[PDB]
Amino acid sequence: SMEQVAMELRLTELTRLLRSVLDQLQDKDPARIFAQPVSLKEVPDYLDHIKHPMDFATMRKRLEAQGYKNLHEFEEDFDLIIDNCMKYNARDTVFYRAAVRLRDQGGVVLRQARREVDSIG
Structure with missing residues (x-):
């Protein structure tokens, strides 16, 4: 249908x-701490946490x-990226601080995204 296309x-x-939002959020992680999945080879207990x-x-x-x-x-x-890190890592770590x-x-970035999504519909 035309509607399904619209x-x-x-x-x-x-x-x-x-x-564009994702690119802007990922620029705020210049250390690439959150770029890839936590490795289950390197953190074998991760899914217990x-x-x-x-x-x-x-x-x-x-x-x-x-x-x-x-x-x-x-x-x-x-929010999962952030909240997972802040639970697994202690306050005094480069990971939590990141x-x-x-x-x-x-x-x-997200404040303006919400306005744009609502605005453009």
Whole structure:
């Protein structure tokens, strides 16, 4: 149908906007601490601690499959990156501190994304 096409164009455009959001959030991680999944070879107990692992490469795979229906779903995944790190790692670690800085800097980007998503519809 024409409607299904219109819906598909909306999703494509959301995916375009979320791709730009993802690039901007990932720039706030210049150390690449959150770029890839925590390695289960190197942290073999990780899944005993963290039940829903997340990272920027995994978000990118979902994004490019158009697997984010709305900004809320995308934000859920970004929040998992941060919250998983802040539980697994102690406060006095470069990893925890990186997550705090990513959260703080990401807030600004996500604030405007929400306005853009609502605005453009």
